[PDB]
Amino acid sequence: FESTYNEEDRSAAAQIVEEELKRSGSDRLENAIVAAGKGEKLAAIDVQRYIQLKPPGTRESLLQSAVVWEYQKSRNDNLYLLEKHGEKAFDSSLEALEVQLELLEKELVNTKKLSQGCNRKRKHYQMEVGARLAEAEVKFGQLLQSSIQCRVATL
Template sequence: MQAHPFLDALPYYEKGYQEQDRAVAMKLVEEEVVRSGGTKLPNPSLDEFTTPFKISERMQNAVQAAGRGEKLQSININRYINLQAPGNPGSLMQSAIALEYLRSREDNLELLKKHGESAWKNHIDSLEEILQNMEREIQTTRKKSQICNRKRKHYQLEMGEKLVDQESQFGNLLLNSIQCRVATLLTSL
């Protein structure tokens, strides 16, 4: 079985070719060369295709695997056949929208880079001012609530004393009333 460099350079290797298959493939290659404006190919020898440089270890492994009849898994030419634009008819519009979004995002990032630090410092300063105002309000509210609680306590103590006086007066009046009734009952007997 004669090896032919044009046929062996195909991007896959399935099994050993029959001479008849090689002849048919070579004929198709020659017809295509003539049809595309080239000349008929000479029958090259293997010596013409030897390389003066060293083949990489990966390539040597691939050649050895091909020699054993294994398929090369890393080469897939299906993606180069019948190429179609990705996506659907609306993809162009979606891409345009995404591009505009990214442009506005880029503008925002440039503005942030240019003015962001000062804006951030101003925001932090305003937050600190708000915090100080809130702390002042809390202190004022605490003072007012302490004053209110003291007044309430003073009022409750004052009312407590008045209540004790009223209770003792009521007790005295009740005692006087009972003594008057007993005296009245004793005199009427």
């Protein structure tokens, strides 16, 4: 609002407010379980011991070797498939990214323009009303002075 105030007045009013306050007075079940678990971080653990490459041993060595072979074949297929097309998909992702970026920034600037317009209309209205009440209180003070001087002058 239109006024010339120091922050000390604001702090005094806030202290009065604090004094008067003192005087007056979906979620599921699995998610809940894991949440009560990991509320203290408790990072859940799963086996990553498929790179240790256990030396010749029991059937576990055979199982690890076979699963690693199958993982390797799938990895081959996926990476060659990735390099069949190159980075055209990446270029399209970046282009759609800049499209959405620009679409957002347009509406952002529209919104700040609207906010500035609301601000200016508000500031105009406050200016006219505040000028009116300023002249009002000035003429009130002059009227008080006139009344008291008249009353003493009648004697």
